[PDB]
């Protein structure tokens, strides 16, 4: 709370108004008296804060420290000019100071609004999520019945494609008797259908891999890995092989094939992957991943790879 | 510890039919029975109730604990415990139950297991958590010549010796790693080696033993198929340092060459694959 | 506020200005006149009383500095240390005879001493004047930048429509071919609504057409890859990577794969094909590329890069790779 | 001599004798039995003896003080202290040492053993009875072979020429016993140098030789390196186990007369694999590819003799 | 400190250092001084009746050389010494116990080149006579090197590789900024003014000079000779769209050059993921011409992409 | 610090060290001294009635050997010792607990090459008799070495490797500047006047001599023997396009030499990035001929190309 309350204030002090805006996904400050908000409609909206003390080097830098200190980190204009932390409510914050930013009077701050809502899968249908698909009714059945059976599916796309929004909805299809264990860095997933579950969160000295490793020791029926980003991918790979009921996850890729390539790469980055050939890894995944849903830049499915 | 242990989990470490105890730092204790289902318990009216820690109770049973910032919040802690099975079904039970029914060579495999094991063949049983892996290998232990000198290596006494007199149990944990026990094991003149479960580095050591021309070995691991077992074995093997110059295809193939059979059990405690070597 | 932003900065600035004086002075002492000349791109000294200036017209102009104390072993050596000490480095005639640093304003400086240089009284210095003059694209057309091309008007439309659509283009060539000046110009064609994030070690790019952007700079313990990693966490719509040089290339590779809007960058190559080869080699140098086959990488790039503009030694495009 | 070996023969006995007693105290009778190869105690009032015939013989020592936690534990320390080691129920629960006469002893205490009153001890009684190779023939060692008379000629003539042979098999397959007998075929003029950690090899046919032994701070690798500097004609490396392998590999390429040795493997092919893997464990093998190593060996080893679970040859490989 | 040396130097090797067309002066601690003339013949000289060559006088010179480069030379931890004469020439001195005995001192001086044979000479000598396209190659070399093409000259040790690339340097536009990388000053700049020589050895590798070279804005790169890892870096340079490159290596043919290049490249760490056929093909594609010289200082092959 | 040794040495092995045509003297801590004659036969000698061979007298000699090379030998951390006698000959000493027991001391001493037989002698003795191309090789050796090819002579300890290379030195043009590197003066220069001998040992390693060697402008380099890291250095030299090189190492075949060369090369730090096949292939490439001598001082292999 002590490392907290002070942050809560600075936060509201600078981005109080913005964080209250609806249908937003990103608030950026480019150390230039302008706050930019990215709305789900995908349009960026600029705001002049010139006449605001809250956005003064001191007030800003205060907020900066309040963020670093909150996650037991530090930010300076020397060895630690770049910082990744979170706001009191979890929202991820990216802060950059000189000399990485252009100059002496420039401070960069970026915040991702984890879109808190949960649509019903049905909603996706009503909206024509699978309308680009030539097998609209096939996929739809595939998703519902596959996930229910316990297949390994992956949802991917670019930043702001709704990947997460989607996997949250398709969770309905998971037997409610299932013990789910999720692994996120920011509480986004919601358990509207299952009662037996446990949420795991990484960050700081705790890596996603740590969570994964502990997940395996908590006897879960389903594992949902919010997103793949680096070394964890390798671990994810082992999990797939260790004959586990079913798995759900997301990652940034531009297609079924890219996702594979991208997985192999993330996996290689891990130590224990020093002796594994590349085609080894790729083929490994291609072998275990049951389906991959890719979402285009218009929150629409443009790819439903199976088998 | 015995006190804190029996304080928090005194009424659960008794229960009925169980294998896992789990506290999600949310006023509720979940226990996994061998039937396969979870049982939830409300412990709201209980005062009894380096952020990641892997330990054991005072009785050996493994303890998995995680504190925040790893768990969700500041008022959330994560705890799990590895509740074993302590009942040695006679292999015939497995047959009576239809353990081999899914197999299209039901009677062939069943003879394979019994004769293979007696012969001293390298077998492996695998599946998902709570598939009865350990329950199974325990019962197939009869088929080992009673004159055999058995050496097991487990972190939690689960295996039982109902048919052998000449044996020694080895347990790891803490500063002592499975690999340690395995290396000692090799120095104890065994006839049969039972490695309760492969999980990490040891896999490499196991590999070498396989190669060191030994009588026969038994073990389990988590995989979803004969093929996955192999892949899985190679990965675990690589994690060890001494495996820095060994190529991947090298490892897998090495295993594919030394393992004689592999029994995979599905989520229904039923065999859906019985693999036999052909290379 | 400035009252504060001043007060806030006040001490710090002073301390910075202090540390730089030694250099700022040595710098102007020796290359004052030279650094002032217009349309230059390189100032070189070969430890022989003559200073060489390379003008954008591509011609080298020699200058006799025989009658100049500034160019004396001691004075020169002084400047040499001022540069090393400026980037917390050291330069000697032993374990550290070769030095890569920068001048007070960012320009990169290369200094070599004996025994790497020919002899005892020979000091080598080379300075790179950075792209400090923006040019709207029209200029390039007027000058016949696409004249050597057999599809002059085709490429031109490709660059304009391709960059606007969000394609991955790369501008390459030799050192001093106008790579950076060119890409800067083609930035107009990016939708002004886009949020751009650049990464360079010296502020050359200029944002004449966009208002929502952030500039990232590396050097010291902060590597380009660090900025790249952070860039990703800043929600950009476009990423302009000044120039690919080593490991970052791998990271760049992944970004291309991670389905990002579009990307701009420059590297040194002699052709579309050389660029590819070159990328793969730079990528392999990264640890996390230890399991990726060569032809894997190359083919990886060949598949993601949309177009490649190569510029010859006469600031003219002699190759425009598409598809 | 005496006045010169009295300061050492004094120390060595005021730490050895204690053990000699404890040893005979618990395993006196057992260590006296003939044709045995292993004595095991599983902390359960029963002593198990493994006879060469391969059968285990159990012995009730329930009514024996010698086998009491204190008496046993005493024996345990006598063993650790003998090789300047320590054994406890903490950081050092597992112990590998030797008896006064050399036999290797393996001891394990709680918490590695099952419980508080459980102490594990295993003694590898080294073999030691040389048959003239002919005995091996009379017994049908080469009977499972389809080229019985070919191999026999190969071993005899090959070893005499100075070929690189390896005899492998499981623990207690007679590996050593066999290589000792095939030593006949090595010209008696040859200068032989052996390297074992326990004197098993016997020189019945050669006079010019030197026995090297390792253990403690001295590794097989050290003996090997010294061996190379003692101008040998034949080298006999009792058994390969870990890094030495790599060193063994260099020797084979360092061109010299011939080499004999043994290792645990289940076949000609397993031998090779095995060799490569052991070689890798050596630092200096950090830049050598795996296939590199394997192929190197396959290139230098002239023949490999594998012995099955029944002390019979079931494989006779030969540069092909 | 310098002066002292200048005296000792002239005292012992005064006459020798004055001889023309020499490249090496060696003393083997045995009253004989040996001079290596460019014609390649060794000329021995009896200095028996010379006090300059007495253990003390010699040893004096030895220290004067060590002390000159702030080094030390003794018959203990520092018996081997590498230093230079006042004028720069490199001196190699060795004392007991490295030398055979107590009264033996070894000294070797390397004289840098400074003469360039005009290309014309080569022609007059029939350097291209064995070639079936004598006049074509000749035009190729002159016009190619002027346009900026990657050429390699190869042959056996002592085939005049270096001597030949030096001569072909004329054809390089005089306005070019050249940068060479040798470990021994052989190349001479008769035709260019804007240039800079880089030398390796010791903790500084050729690859280091190459890397610095690339940050010095050269127009032309002259790499004295390819031998090991640098080969890989060299490869990168070629792909990095560089105006033109000149270099030499030991090979017995256009084809061997290539193989040889690929192998020297593989020896570099960063070449761990590059296939072999990958490398060779890479080169075959970048190199424009290869000139092979036979054991009789004559061109027996003139490959042209 | 030398005189005490000279005494113990002559004390125990005085007579033995005097015998002619021997190559090894071994003592197996058993009152018997064994001598290996060049004819390859071992000759045993009973020294039971000799105090020189008493644990104390022996142990004394042992220490004199350790102390001579600033080393130590005991029956604890230093039971194994590699040193040399006053004249250079290498001595190997082993004490309990490495030797079989308390009263066992092992000692072995190599009799370096001293006598030089001219090449003709080797022919008269049928050195190339086991060769199917007796007259081809002989011509190969003579014309190759004269041309300046990289040859290697290998075999077992005491196979005459050194004696042989010494004899084949005739064929090197007498105008050549030869530079050898040994740790014991064995090589002789009966045909060349311009040469310098380099010797290593102590703080000076062969690699050091090798590095200086390269700065002494030699025409030919004779590397007494390859044994560990220098091998890498040797490799570079091979690559650095040098006139010709002669050397010996213990291998059992042409192929073994190669493998053996790559392993030794790997032991050097700078070879941390070079793949194994990279090195081997590097050698295979450069080495022109390898002469292997069997345990009967006879050539049983004459690899070429």
Automatic annotation (TrEMBL), chain D:
Mg(2+) binds at residue 176. Gene3D superfamilies: 3.30.450.90, P-loop containing nucleotide triphosphate hydrolases. InterPro entries: P-loop_NTPase, T2SS/T4SS_dom, T4SS_GSP_E_ATPase, VirB11. One of its GO terms (cellular component) is type IV secretion system complex. It holds the Pfam family T2SSE. It comes from the Bacteria. ADP binds at residues 52, 124, 131, 172, 174-177. Keywords: Metal-binding, Nucleotide-binding. Belongs to the GSP E family. PANTHER family: TWITCHING MOTILITY PROTEIN PILT, TYPE IV PILUS RETRACTATION ATPASE PILT. This is Cag alpha.
